[PDB]
Design a binder for this molecule. Structure first.
Ligand code: MN
Length: 636
């Protein structure tokens, strides 16, 4: 009855359940990772109800000792929109999802309107449609897009773009005429300005200059291209850039935020071409600070030298190759050098000095093969443009703070106020004077940051950094905890950064007389997707580059980046590749070996033998092309 029914329902609700994530491997039974040590065993027949990565509620089935979990509710499904390689016969297609841990092929079927005959091996986008835990018969996906075919060498670029639903083209750009508002655009032409960029860039978005002043003072002029002089709010090209947010840069291939006809010409600041530029005046001295000596003002220049980072850095030491032809550009290089080497001193004493992990560059043939993977050096000329840029992005942050309290600012809070006392405890182990009170305040943050520098290695720094939040983007001004900036505002690259383009329009309002709520929402999101994309293509290419090295005695220095319970992750110093080293390769006696994810150490016979940050030599044991995984072993 009613009666019987009601009883059964209550007996049903009160029964033991746990919520967790399914962790399957190449076995039949899996586990529900509940938490710290709670993991339940999921038996083979029950494994077929769920997918590795699914978040589920399970009924807990009572047994004498070893308990069992029976999948009952799907909380959060692992797959929704995904990519994979198609298989099967004409009318019975399946798709193996592109993920190390999901071997099983999912029945599928093309959408409405999709007409492509899905060959075998075809890469497809799919959307999950059926799940056994939703009362469905079995797993069912819908093929919604064709990416490319199986043997396609360009698989790495296309699949990555498709899985993140990123554009693969520049926006269509009808380039209409240039605009007018109240442009009292000045005249800094005659005075010879210089670009300092890489070898192959057809767009230089920045120019530089300095003046012979009287007593102990300098005068930097940062000159940045004017995209907003042509593009207008609402404009088609305005609305496409809003969607894209950032230029997506990948190994050998970029997806421009803006049409090339601006980038390469109209906005580019070439050689001896008159170009409408937005500039910034400033003065520095022996310590190096600027006050009410900064004006932001539209102008126009005729750049008189296209200058390469290495040629420039060659001369700023002495070498055998290059000489600046002019006495104009030559003296103007000495200018910017003294500027740079003095400007570093203000940020070491009032901010946070940078050590920006060495960008790796892929060198590819016209067919996509990896020839090499060099690491981009940070010589002096790089630190010249870096310095200038840094200083010149600073000036905007203040200005736009005073006029509006609007801007596109980058807000790094530092440590999560939750982990707050979790941290002052940690250092307390390491024996480090950290009052939980001050901590949060910038003064504390940056004073702690100093003490870390004083350490033998970067171990403790790696530790504490599991405690901070991520740099965000906001409309209000904030502090750049990570940079040591009071406030930070980017206008350095309006051509690649919508934020910097929005800043430009705000920077125009300054000279003259609020970016909407969800703008930052999708600016953050695109930067994430852009970062994952770049990383995923690189993972493919590393696997291809290193393949022939597997089983060989080639050694590679590798820094240990993360310790897990089953082993440790290293990044090869020379190329940046990430490899895994399983624990039975670290020591032959398992009970003698401890890997703590939580302590960033590996102990052998009670002692610490490796820690996050260490640099050891490794050989390449295995490279799995299907999954792009690289296994390494320490040199013995
Ligand atoms: Mn540049």
């Amino acid at each position: 009855n009613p009666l019987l029914a009601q009883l059964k329902q209550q007996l049903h609700s009160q029964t033991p359940r746990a919520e967790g994530v399914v962790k399957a491997t190449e076995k039949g039974f899996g586990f529900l990772e509940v938490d710290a040590q709670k993991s339940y065993f999921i038996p083979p027949p029950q494994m077929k109800k769920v997918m590795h990565g699914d978040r589920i509620i399970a009924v807990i089935h009572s047994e004498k000792e070893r308990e069992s979990a029976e999948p009952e509710e799907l909380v959060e499904p692992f797959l929704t929109r995904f990519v994979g390689k198609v298989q099967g016969k004409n009318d019975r297609l399946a798709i193996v999802p592109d993920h190390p841990l999901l071997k099983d092929a999912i029945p599928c079927r093309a959408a409405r309107g999709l007409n492509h005959e899905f060959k075998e091996g075809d890469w497809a986008v799919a959307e999950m449609r059926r799940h056994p835990l939703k009362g469905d018969r079995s797993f069912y996906a819908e093929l919604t897009q064709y990416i490319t075919f199986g043997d396609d060498h360009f698989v790495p670029w296309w699949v990555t773009l498709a899985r993140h639903n990123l554009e693969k083209e520049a926006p269509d750009g009808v380039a209409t005429e240039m605009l007018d508002e109240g442009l009292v655009r000045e005249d800094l032409t005659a005075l010879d300005f210089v670009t300092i960029d890489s070898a192959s860039t057809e767009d230089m978005d920045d120019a530089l200059f300095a003046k012979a002043l009287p007593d102990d003072k300098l005068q930097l002029i940062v000159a940045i291209a004017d995209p907003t002089a042509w593009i207008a709010e609402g404009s088609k090209l305005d609305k496409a850039a809003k969607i894209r947010a950032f230029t997506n840069y990948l190994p050998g291939f970029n997806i421009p935020m803006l049409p090339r006809e601006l980038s390469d010409d109209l906005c580019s600041l070439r050689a001896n071409e008159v170009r409408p530029v937005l500039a910034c005046r400033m003065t520095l001295s022996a310590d190096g600070t600027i006050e009410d000596n900064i004006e932001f003002f539209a102008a126009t220049i005729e750049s008189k030298a296209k200058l390469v980072y290495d040629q420039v850095s060659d001369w700023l030491e002495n070498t055998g190759d290059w000489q600046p032809e002019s006495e104009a550009i030559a003296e103007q290089v000495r200018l910017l050098a003294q500027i740079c080497q003095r400007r570093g001193e203000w940020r070491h004493n009032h901010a946070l000095v940078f050590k920006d992990r060495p960008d790796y560059r892929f060198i590819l043939g016209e067919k996509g093969e990896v020839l090499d993977i060099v690491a981009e050096p940070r010589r002096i000329a790089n630190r010249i443009v870096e310095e200038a840029m840094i200083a010149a992005n600073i000036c905007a942050a203040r200005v736009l703070r005073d006029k509006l309290g609007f801007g596109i600012y980058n807000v790094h809070m530092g440590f999560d106020p939750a982990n707050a006392d979790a941290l002052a405890a940690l250092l307390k182990t390491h024996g480090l004077h950290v009052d939980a009170e001050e901590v949060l305040t910038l003064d504390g943050f940056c004073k702690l940051r100093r003490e870390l520098d004083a350490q033998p290695t970067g171990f403790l720094d790696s530790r504490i950094r599991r405690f901070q939040s991520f740099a965000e983007i906001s409309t209000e001004p904030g502090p750049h905890f990570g940079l040591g900036l009071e406030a930070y505002a980017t206008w350095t690259s309006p051509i690649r950064k919508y934020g910097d383009m929005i800043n430009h329009r705000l920077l125009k309002a300054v000279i003259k007389g609020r970016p909407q709520d969800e703008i930052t929402v999708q600016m953050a999101e695109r930067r994430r997707l852009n970062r994952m994309a770049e990383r995923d293509v690189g993972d493919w290419l590393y696997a291809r580059f290193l393949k022939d090295k597997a089983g060989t005695d080639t050694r590679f220095a590798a820094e240990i980046v993360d310790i897990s319970r089953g082993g440790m992750r290293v990044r090869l110093v020379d190329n940046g590749a990430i490899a895994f080293i399983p624990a039975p390769f670290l020591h032959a006696v398992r009970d003698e070996l401890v890997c703590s994810q939580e302590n960033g150490t590996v102990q052998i016979k009670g002692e610490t033998v490796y820690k996050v940050t260490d640099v050891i030599d490794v050989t390449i044991a295995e490279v799995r092309m299907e999954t792009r995984s690289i296994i390494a072993r320490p040199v013995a």
